[PDB]
Amino acid sequence: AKLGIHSNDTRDAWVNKIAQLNTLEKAAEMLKQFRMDHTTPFRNSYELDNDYLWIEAKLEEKVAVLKARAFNEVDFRHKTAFGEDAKSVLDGTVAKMNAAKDKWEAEKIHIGFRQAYKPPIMPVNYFLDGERQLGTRLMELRNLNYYDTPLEELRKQRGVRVVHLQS
Amino acid sequence: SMLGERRRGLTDPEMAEVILKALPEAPLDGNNKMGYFVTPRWKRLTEYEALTVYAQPNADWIAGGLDWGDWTQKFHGGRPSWGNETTELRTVDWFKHRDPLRRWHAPYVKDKAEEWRYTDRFLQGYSADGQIRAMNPTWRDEFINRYWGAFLFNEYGLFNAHSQGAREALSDVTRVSLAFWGFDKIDIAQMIQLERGFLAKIVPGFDESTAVPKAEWTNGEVYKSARLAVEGLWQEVFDWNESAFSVHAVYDALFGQFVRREFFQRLAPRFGDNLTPFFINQAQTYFQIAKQGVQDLYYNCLGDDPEFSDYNRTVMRNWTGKWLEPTIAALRDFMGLFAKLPAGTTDKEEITASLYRVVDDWIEDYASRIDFKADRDQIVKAVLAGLK
Amino acid sequence: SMLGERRRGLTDPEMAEVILKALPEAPLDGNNKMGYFVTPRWKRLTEYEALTVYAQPNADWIAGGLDWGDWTQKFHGGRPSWGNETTELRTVDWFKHRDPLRRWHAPYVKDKAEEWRYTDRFLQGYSADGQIRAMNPTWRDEFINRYWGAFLFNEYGLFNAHSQGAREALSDVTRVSLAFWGFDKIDIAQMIQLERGFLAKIVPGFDESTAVPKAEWTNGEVYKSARLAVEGLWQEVFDWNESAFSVHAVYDALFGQFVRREFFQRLAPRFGDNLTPFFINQAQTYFQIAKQGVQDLYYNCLGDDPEFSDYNRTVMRNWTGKWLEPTIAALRDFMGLFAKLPAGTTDKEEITASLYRVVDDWIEDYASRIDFKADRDQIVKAVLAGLK
Amino acid sequence: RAPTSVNAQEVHRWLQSFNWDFKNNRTKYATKYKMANETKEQFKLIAKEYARMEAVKDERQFGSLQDALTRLNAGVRVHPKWNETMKVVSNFLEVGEYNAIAATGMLWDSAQAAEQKNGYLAQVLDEIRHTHQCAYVNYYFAKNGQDPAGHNDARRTRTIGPLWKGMKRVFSDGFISGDAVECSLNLQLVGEACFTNPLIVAVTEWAAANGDEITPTVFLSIETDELRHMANGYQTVVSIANDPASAKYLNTDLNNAFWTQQKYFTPVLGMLFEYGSKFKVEPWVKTWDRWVYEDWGGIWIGRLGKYGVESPRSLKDAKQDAYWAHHDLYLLAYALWPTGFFRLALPDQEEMEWFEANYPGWYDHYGKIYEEWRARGCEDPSSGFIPLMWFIENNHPIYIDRVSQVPFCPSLAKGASTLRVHEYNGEMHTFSDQWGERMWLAEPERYECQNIFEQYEGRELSEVIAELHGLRSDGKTLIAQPHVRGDKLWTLDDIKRLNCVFKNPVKAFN
Amino acid sequence: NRAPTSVNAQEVHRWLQSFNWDFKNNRTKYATKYKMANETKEQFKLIAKEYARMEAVKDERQFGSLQDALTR
Ligand SMILES: [Co+2]
Ligand SMILES: [Co+2]
């Protein structure tokens, strides 16, 4: 076949797939789906681990190009690729983050925000303003009494399956 | 001791012989050109390129990167150390940019250092020559101290607008250019204060305190919209390219050029002021140097990108429209300063003509490059409304 | 080869071993300061002095010399290589002089090199910035080209007046200063032409040829007395000190300072010309540099000589008078230039104020140092008696 | 009318006033801390003066390099092993310098006091100079040295090997990804203060001893700038000491930063020093204890106690796992020599004595191993042997720490032999210590770096090397070598003949 | 156009010859049996500024090597 670090069948396959995304809604939906399926520790699968970063970028290039052509200037600056009001989404997410009861709740909010609104879905200005606010709260909740929970209990909280231990 | 206790392998007979013995008969590869794999912008690869291109460890998922895989440590939440998500602009390769002046650190501080030492000599010659005697007192105490002074805050703000870009720039060549554009802006702010400090040493009673020009900046009318635009450009823009582009290809290109060149550089000489023009000369030199880099990055590389040319121009045209209005408002408020001048200093025709020079230069050097349809007379008309 | 065929004593194991073996355990004299026997002008001996004082092989028969005996080879006739007979001034020691700026070759070319590179950068910014658009076309095509240009020959002639001094100077410290004073002068003349060459490039129709400015200098009326004064100081004076003193503490201090500072540096700004002042900033920085040197030699050393103070002041007062006349004459002829200026440029009130600035700075900086009784009113009156 | 002028301090006097208030005047980055807007900076510089003092340093530096040193053939008369060491030392430090540019740009953004922004600004500019300086060292050795390969393309050939991954954690991502304050700690309070500055001096020492006068010329110049960078790290702590958040999070971010930095440098620096040189300067063991334990974790860290700063709680473990760390790692680096961009050598007889002498027990463990690899013909291209094979035969799996990226072989290491393997949402993760594991468990999304085995899984060795341009200009001889001699250099074909295919060791787990 | 423009040494030197003019005492002050042609050209077309710069560069390397590497 054709394997390789920077060029392989998987990447070619996605380039062809992306080439057929010719309307904003279809392309934007696929990018969002891709992020749910292949990014973050909560991805639905690790099958594209070695190529998802690169494929996501190529998918992003297409959504961006389609958005610029479909959106008027005001919407390109203030609406998400899905037609949502960026400010509303940002404020609502931040509000949710500030209500978070704990670091576990907070991490889900932040990570999901990225998966769903990362540019070119949400305009860069709003997204990084979100990163600014959500990240602060996430860290405040996480870095409090950071070492109190013993490794034995933390593993359980994270919910990992302890496969092998030695010491 | 005279010889010292530390033995060096280059000179110590015993150690050197050990080293010489392990050496090969000739180099293990005849390719002695570091950075040979870099696509040269010019005829032959330059030192500037070799020492700079690919220093940034980007992976292939950030256009042009040669590495592979994710970052080793990201932000809480998952944000990458550097990522495509930090700017709306897209490109086939972020490493394509080239500073036309090929400035890496050494050449950069060398030129500024020369400018620093000559400035000192100029000032010592200026003071010793007593040239201050022929400067109009009103121009000196009110327009230089208060109004030129308040402009240091404009330049200071534009400097700070670069902070985020220094962190998010997606390539080494772009980070170095940005850093230098920002550094030149703070230099100018400091040169404005430098002149004020100088005047305070040669002119009895001249207060170098920044209190007066700062109050003009924060609470006056002449610079109100300018300050509003600067505060936005700096703190309300989270996109490093929107920031650099809007600062250099919109706001500073119009408002900045008008204030520095069409007001102070143009009028100071009329009041016997060769002092301020010495410093404005530096600012304009810096402005023209940065312009070459700004045009190479935004027009040559991004606006003319083989795959994203149309997309980037749409985005930049978007930004131009977004920031043109605040920039016009800034110029409009600034028109109020002309009423503060001694009668006969200048008139509406000169002012209008000077507005057109700035607008026409901007359309030729910037707007036209991205097909932005600017209407010269409509822009000027909007600004003139500010003439009190 | 990779190692080369040449073996070096510092790195070759065999040779270095032999060298190290012959070395003493410690220096054979703890006095590691070259020029230690030199009498410091300041707190601690400077590199400037160490590398310069006593380089000239003068024997004790030339005030200050440390050598002995006649010269090995003299001129046909018997004239000494260097001798007391080449200058009227006498001193207890010709090595007393000290350039206040402590300039030996290195610092000297470093500073001028910085000025050169900044000048180039400035011109590239100026042209790219289109600052020429606001410059008075008449001022440029007539006063800058013809009258400012013609002044290059004045400076050039003053440069050449230093040729004999370069040969006859009785000490190293004096020879170096003299050489730098003259080199700065030709620099200025070349900078004048540089501007004209610059204009020719950015202003179509502008002819850089020296034909016009030369004819004005050679046959004109404005600089007639000026040229006569130059030709005499240069080719009719055979005393190296009279030449240096008369050129720097009389002629250029009065005429030159007036033309550069009180005419062009003062009026150019009124015609939207920041270009010419950029170059005059240099000429004036240079003038002020040289002045400290001239003052230290003729006043601090000679004029205040613990044994010939009285004698030297007499000779200089004599020279001051001898040349104060041709200078005044030069200044009167120059006045006729104001008549060619567009109406409203300047009034007799301003001119009188400028003349007094020159005359007063001159009395304060030179004439009063040798107790020369100058009459500010009489001088200004004599010069003014040449206006339109 | 006397000659007068204005200096930097006279202008700097009013710099704090340059910043003004407005609703949105705030940092654009997420942070648990608040930097006081009254914070002052130590050096009263302005752009013009900063440029001059640096230009003066460049003058002397490039003057030496271009004239005297070149005339002396300094680029060549260096020990072969050290010519290779500098390919890694100079290029890896380069990325640290580079990322410190972005890192300090981020601190400049974080700071609200004009003077503190200015302090960080000078560092931004300094890290640009340092990047270019490290670049110049590689540039100079490529142009005038005994082996240009690696020195001439490290920016892309560095991507083949596992050692590069960890460098990015401590000197790239660690400098810019996270709370600005957390980054400041990794960069200035820990990174530069504990390792970088001491390292810079040490490198010039080892360099001079091995005939290299190029590096001292550049690095000694870099060192003069780092004095100011220390003040930035100190002022960071000062700017946040009076903020309630500080008591809550400072020592945690500091402890995490300390572990992060220590984890990579404790083994890597010692490895480049002891194994990358002919003439030794000092055993890594005592150098480490002085730097980390004595000077930093005692003297430097103590002076900050007045701001609530405490000694890193993980300092004890760090010391415990320190002793054999670098030794354990060279075994791996050499076993994986075909993946580097530099040539490595087995310890010679004299060296083994030094090693055994300075590290009782070294021979019985590592010594014997190297002798067997030697016996198996690891230096010979016709042997068809690569130390990696030995690890496979003797069932000694090499894992990559998901967090630090540092390679470890717990079944062989004389130092830490702890291994934690977790499965989470369909992915396996391997950790080598309790501190890194904690980091991943609490911040899973920050550490998703794929390791070389994951990326190269199922790939034949020669194909990876060829694809990532790991060859010399002849297009056949490998850049990396199992020996530093000038003859019998391995070719891509010698590697292909070995038919070495990578596999992800964690897959063995059920 | 507003293209970045400057002037170099050669460009100024081209007119250097005309810098001298005819006049009265325009002659050497030193005894000599020969007459140097007043039309004589020089090989290197330099002006004070460029001269200074080319020498400054050499000084840079020289003193750099002396104060730094050589001293070390
Ligand atoms: Co650094
Ligand atoms: Co640093």
Side-chain angles (χ1 to χ4, degrees), chain C residues 208-220 222-324 326-339 341-379:
Chain C
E208 54 160 36
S209 169
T210 53
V212 169
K214 189 177 181 180
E216 175 65 50
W217 168 258
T218 55
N219 299 60
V222 183
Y223 294 110
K224 189 162 179 295
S225 276
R227 179 168 50 61
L228 295 181
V230 174
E231 299 169 356
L233 293 162
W234 170 14
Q235 299 290 32
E236 286 180 51
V237 184
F238 285 68
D239 183 324
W240 61 280
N241 276 306
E242 175 184 352
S243 190
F245 178 79
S246 302
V247 168
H248 302 297
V250 176
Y251 185 65
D252 198 51
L254 289 170
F255 180 67
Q257 277 302 76
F258 183 74
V259 176
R260 297 186 300 270
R261 191 186 70 185
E262 302 306 353
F263 190 92
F264 296 85
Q265 183 79 315
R266 188 175 84 82
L267 304 191
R270 291 183 172 176
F271 298 73
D273 171 23
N274 275 305
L275 180 61
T276 304
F278 177 92
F279 293 102
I280 298 177
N281 282 330
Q282 285 179 36
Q284 298 307 294
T285 296
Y286 296 177
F287 180 85
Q288 294 303 317
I289 292 298
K291 182 189 71 175
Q292 294 185 62
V294 177
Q295 299 178 314
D296 178 275
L297 173 55
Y298 299 94
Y299 309 147
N300 182 206
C301 295
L302 299 176
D304 301 359
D305 187 286
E307 181 160 53
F308 301 87
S309 178
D310 184 293
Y311 171 76
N312 291 309
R313 295 193 183 193
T314 295
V315 183
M316 293 186 272
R317 278 198 296 276
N318 183 307
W319 288 333
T320 300
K322 178 184 176 182
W323 300 93
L324 175 47
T327 302
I328 292 173
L331 281 175
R332 174 184 285 87
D333 280 45
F334 190 63
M335 298 305 254
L337 180 57
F338 292 97
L341 291 176
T345 302
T346 184
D347 57 34
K348 183 175 182 179
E349 192 173 312
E350 294 193 308
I351 298 181
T352 298
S354 68
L355 275 298
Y356 272 95
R357 275 199 292 280
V358 171
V359 179
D360 290 354
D361 288 333
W362 177 63
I363 299 179
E364 165 65 296
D365 287 318
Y366 311 81
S368 62
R369 300 305 176 76
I370 60 177
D371 291 347
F372 184 77
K373 303 304 172 59
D375 189 300
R376 57 201 299 295
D377 304 307
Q378 292 316 299
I379 301 305

Side-chain angles (χ1 to χ4, degrees), chain A residues 73-100 102-106:
Chain A
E73 298 198 314
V74 163
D75 292 344
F76 185 82
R77 300 199 284 261
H78 311 297
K79 279 189 182 181
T80 64
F82 295 120
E84 306 156 289
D85 176 68
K87 189 175 174 180
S88 300
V89 179
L90 169 59
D91 295 342
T93 310
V94 168
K96 221 144 299 174
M97 177 60 84
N98 290 328
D102 60 53
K103 64 185 173 185
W104 307 99
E105 189 166 302

Side-chain angles (χ1 to χ4, degrees), chain B residues 197-209:
Chain B
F198 179 69
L199 287 166
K201 288 192 180 186
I202 70 173
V203 177
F206 190 100
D207 194 351
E208 65 161 31
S209 173

Side-chain angles (χ1 to χ4, degrees), chain D residues 97 126-127 130 192 222 226 229:
Chain D
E97 297 302 347
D126 288 331
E127 306 306 10
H130 300 178
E192 306 176 319
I222 292 182
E226 291 294 329
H229 296 189

Side-chain angles (χ1 to χ4, degrees), chain D residues 46-226 228-293 295-302 304-315 317-319 321-344:
Chain D
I46 61 169
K48 285 297 207 297
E49 173 66 8
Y50 163 84
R52 189 201 63 70
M53 54 182 262
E54 293 312 286
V56 163
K57 302 175 179 183
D58 285 351
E59 261 199 291
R60 311 202 324 161
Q61 176 191 83
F62 293 116
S64 295
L65 292 170
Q66 305 182 300
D67 189 70
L69 293 175
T70 291
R71 188 195 323 129
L72 291 173
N73 212 191
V76 179
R77 309 171 74 82
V78 182
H79 198 287
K81 293 183 63 178
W82 190 259
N83 169 276
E84 301 307 295
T85 294
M86 290 309 307
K87 293 179 186 181
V88 177
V89 172
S90 198
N91 184 79
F92 277 26
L93 284 183
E94 170 186 286
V95 82
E97 297 302 347
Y98 188 74
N99 271 68
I101 300 170
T104 54
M106 188 184 188
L107 289 167
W108 153 18
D109 189 274
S110 306
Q112 293 305 292
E115 278 189 37
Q116 185 173 20
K117 281 187 184 297
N118 199 52
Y120 290 145
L121 174 61
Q123 190 165 343
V124 168
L125 269 290
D126 288 331
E127 306 306 10
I128 288 173
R129 178 163 98 109
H130 300 178
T131 296
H132 286 147
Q133 279 171 296
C134 286
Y136 208 82
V137 173
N138 287 134
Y139 178 100
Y140 189 95
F141 274 116
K143 180 162 61 186
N144 319 110
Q146 59 191 283
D147 181 21
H151 268 126
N152 63 10
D153 55 23
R155 290 176 183 169
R156 78 169 177 189
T157 51
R158 92 230 299 203
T159 68
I160 302 164
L163 298 175
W164 172 232
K165 296 292 191 188
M167 191 65 262
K168 292 197 288 186
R169 199 290 172 97
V170 301
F171 270 26
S172 285
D173 306 308
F175 285 178
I176 62 173
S177 300
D179 189 326
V181 177
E182 186 198 35
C183 295
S184 180
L185 298 178
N186 270 300
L187 173 61
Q188 307 154 313
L189 219 62
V190 176
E192 306 176 319
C194 184
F195 298 107
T196 301
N197 305 336
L199 170 62
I200 297 298
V201 180
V203 171
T204 64
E205 221 64 79
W206 288 77
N210 291 83
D212 169 14
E213 293 301 337
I214 300 304
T215 305
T217 301
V218 178
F219 280 31
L220 284 177
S221 188
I222 292 182
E223 199 299 307
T224 67
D225 299 328
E226 291 294 329
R228 299 193 297 284
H229 296 189
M230 295 299 277
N232 276 163
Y234 178 98
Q235 282 303 165
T236 298
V237 179
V238 172
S239 65
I240 69 173
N242 279 64
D243 170 46
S246 188
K248 303 175 184 180
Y249 320 112
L250 192 51
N251 282 148
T252 291
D253 284 326
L254 174 58
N255 182 61
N256 282 162
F258 169 73
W259 189 264
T260 294
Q261 299 299 130
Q262 177 276 159
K263 184 69 181 185
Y264 185 78
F265 292 120
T266 293
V268 176
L269 294 188
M271 173 180 84
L272 298 171
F273 280 166
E274 310 199 327
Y275 298 79
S277 64
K278 171 52 182 167
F279 303 104
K280 276 57 179 176
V281 174
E282 185 189 13
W284 183 232
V285 278
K286 67 172 300 183
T287 313
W288 189 87
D289 185 89
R290 178 174 62 256
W291 292 11
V292 185
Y293 233 57
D295 311 315
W296 190 82
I299 303 300
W300 174 268
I301 198 66
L304 297 182
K306 47 183 290 185
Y307 302 105
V309 179
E310 305 180 7
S311 166
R313 67 171 65 202
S314 55
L315 178 46
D317 296 319
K319 186 178 179 59
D321 307 83
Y323 197 70
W324 302 101
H326 55 129
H327 292 131
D328 287 341
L329 185 59
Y330 193 68
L331 281 176
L332 303 187
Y334 189 82
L336 297 172
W337 71 264
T339 67
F341 59 103
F342 45 88
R343 307 141 57 219
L344 295 176

